[PDB]
């Protein structure tokens, strides 16, 4: 190994590199996620396709189990390592314990790995922040987030990446319980949040949902077009 | 050691008033052939305690080496503190037990005799780690042959003199010369008091054979 202190404290009581490795997350792509009562929804923005290539390998949303889903921001390689180890961990949990994997267990593993990885001798911290969405115990929807420190932190909706303060400001006018909680209206409202992004080109939107019993469904950018059209229709009804 | 090559034979030791006398013979038999008829089987440890052993002689050379180095180290500490004979007994018991726990036993049968601080000491260490104190010890076939003489006279007389102890040892070694096949008419007497440790020379026995003139 390398016997040196990548972790040193500040003269005023900080960690120079963990809060600062959050900046690499802060300068990555945006991704949101909410829970409905029966259907959970998330998606990433900024596919940033050069219109003439493939994109099926750059997918930032994958799965570890048939119950749980991933998301991240920041740089993608640390996400790839964490996802590989997370697949291994969920399957090793399936080896002993015969349950479907609880979301809280795999988040504790990810956060525990992240903190004992940052603690050790000469290993660069993972500059990601994951979103771990699943519904296992009696179909109860849960979504947790991470941090480069390794703090799993359960929410009901979330916004990360570039300009997440703005996205959460849209989420402020979106924190009503009603908002009618339909599947199409909640998904399209998430779509409207991704529409409140810095560019909102209309074709770079990628969203995937899970209805707490099925598997992952990759959508088709015509249903989202009708979602955007009816969002524009409701915006016209405001006038 | 699984198979002892060159074995000794029985060792006798007994306390008396302010001292312990130990005598063992000087034979190095291999099988039945008395191959090494001039060897030393008693180590005179530094100034108080004193060692005599049985079984494989090479292992006794090894423990002589190790104990010599330890005694040299404490004497070079210069603190004025030495090993009590009971401490040596404890170390030797732990050494033999840790040998046999690893299934590599030291084939020996050891007797530790010492006189320190007014009190005599006579300790025993077996190969298997069985270790105890006794007013009179007898190893090998000595526990079968010269032990009841020791236990007879110590029951008959609880205290002793130095002369009575030495005479009784002389008689027991004569008897062991009479009917041990692994025995030899040459033995040395070693004695500790408060005056130091003394190794006597290669004494012998005076025998009788007047039963042979009968048919």
């Amino acid at each position: 190994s390398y016997d040196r202190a990548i972790t040193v404290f500040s003269p005023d009581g900080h960690l120079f590199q963990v809060e600062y490795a959050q900046e690499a997350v802060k300068k990555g792509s945006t991704a949101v996620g909410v829970r409905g009562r029966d259907i959970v929804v998330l998606g990433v923005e900024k596919k940033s396709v050069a219109k003439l290539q493939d994109e099926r390998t750059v997918r930032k949303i994958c799965a570890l189990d048939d119950n749980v889903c991933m998301a991240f921001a920041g740089l993608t390689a640390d996400a790839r390592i964490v996802i590989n180890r997370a697949r291994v961990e969920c399957q090793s949990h399936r080896l002993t314990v015969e349950d479907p994997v609880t979301v809280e267990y795999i988040t504790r593993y990810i956060a525990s790995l992240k903190q004992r990885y940052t603690q050790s001798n000469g290993r660069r911290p993972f500059g990601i922040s994951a979103l771990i969405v699943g519904f296992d115990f009696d179909g109860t929807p849960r979504l947790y987030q991470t941090d480069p420190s390794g703090t799993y932190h359960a929410w009901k909706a979330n916004a990360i990446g570039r300009g997440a303060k703005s996205v959460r400001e849209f989420l402020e006018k979106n924190y009503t319980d009603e908002a009618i909680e339909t599947d199409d209206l909640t998904i399209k409202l998430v779509i409207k949040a991704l529409l409140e992004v810095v560019q909102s080109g209309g074709k770079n939107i990628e969203l995937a949902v899970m209805r707490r019993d099925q598997s992952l469904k990759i959508l088709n950018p015509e249903e989202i077009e009708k979602y955007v059209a009816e969002i524009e229709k409701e915006k016209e009804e405001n006038e | 050691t699984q198979n002892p090559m060159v074995t000794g034979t029985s060792v006798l030791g007994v306390k008396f008033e302010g001292g312990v006398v130990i005598a063992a013979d000087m034979l190095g038999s291999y099988g039945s052939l008395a191959r090494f008829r001039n060897i030393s089987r008693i180590m005179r440890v530094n100034n108080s305690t004193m060692l005599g052993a049985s079984g494989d002689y090479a292992d006794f050379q090894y423990l002589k080496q190790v104990l010599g180095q330890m005694v040299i180290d404490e004497e070079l500490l210069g603190d004025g503190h030495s090993y009590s004979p009971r401490a040596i007994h404890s170390w030797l018991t732990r050494a033999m037990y840790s040998r046999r726990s690893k299934m590599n036993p030291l084939w020996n049968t050891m007797v530790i005799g010492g006189y320190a601080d007014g009190e005599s000491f006579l300790g025993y260490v077996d190969m298997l780690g069985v270790a105890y104190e006794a007013p009179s010890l007898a190893t090998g076939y000595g526990a079968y042959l010269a032990q009841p003489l020791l236990r007879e006279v110590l029951e008959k007389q609880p205290v002793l003199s130095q002369t009575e102890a030495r005479d009784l040892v002389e008689r027991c070694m004569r008897v062991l010369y009479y009917r041990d096949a692994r025995s030899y008419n040459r033995f040395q007497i070693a004695t500790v008091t408060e005056k130091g440790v003394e190794i006597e020379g290669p004494l012998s026995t005076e025998t009788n054979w007047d039963i042979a003139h009968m048919i």
Binding site: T96, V97, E98, D99, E104, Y105 | -
Partner: protein, 201 residues
């Protein structure tokens, strides 16, 4: 040595004897064989005292760790799985262990059977020991699922009485534990001679 266990509509019955011999010589008459792992688990002693006692204590330690880490009580299958994985790592070195695991689950009743040979299996009735076959006979006479409570008490008590009556390596006090949804409850500790006077006629 003869233990049994069977689950039914109202939970799980566990009974055992209390004789533990040594070859042809009986050591004690009051060996509490059903090792109380938790307020919701009961382990037994089935072949060997030290192995069953030690490994069930280690399993109880592990279960308490699991509960204190997840704030949620362990299942039965998980405990049997952990026990089988811990026992499997000394296979062939001479461990004799045939214990049983009983408890209440999210699914409800749970009954598994873990050997030192590693035959972790589910089921509804089990019986371990030298005279286990006698218990199998009279139990599979009297077995149903829709039994009452005192009927099941009489079934287990009669079964252990017949087993200790025929086998030579079994005897002593008949313990009787009852696993419920909330927790297990000791019923009674009955001697053989009392059952002989009561059930001989």
């Amino acid at each position: 040595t003869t233990t049994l266990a069977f689950k039914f509509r109202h939970g799980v019955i566990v009974a055992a004897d209390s004789r533990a011999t040594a070859g042809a010589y009986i050591a004690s008459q009051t060996v509490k064989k059903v090792i109380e792992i938790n307020p919701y688990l009961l382990g037994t002693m089935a072949g060997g005292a030290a192995d069953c006692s030690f490994w069930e204590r280690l399993l109880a330690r592990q279960c308490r760790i699991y509960e204190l880490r997840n704030k949620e009580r362990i299942s039965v299958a998980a405990a049997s799985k952990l026990l089988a994985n811990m026992v499997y790592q000394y296979k062939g070195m001479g461990l004799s262990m045939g214990t049983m695991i009983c408890g209440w689950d999210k699914r409800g009743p749970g009954l598994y059977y873990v050997d030192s040979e590693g035959n972790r299996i589910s089921g509804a009735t089990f019986s371990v020991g030298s005279g286990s076959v006698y218990a199998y006979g009279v139990m599979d006479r009297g077995y149903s699922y829709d039994l009452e409570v005192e009927q099941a008490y009489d079934l287990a008590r009669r079964a252990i009485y017949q087993a200790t009556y025929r086998d030579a390596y079994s005897g002593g006090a008949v313990n009787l534990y009852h696993v419920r949804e909330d927790g297990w409850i000791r019923v009674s500790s009955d001697n053989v001679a009392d059952l002989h006077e009561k059930y001989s006629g």
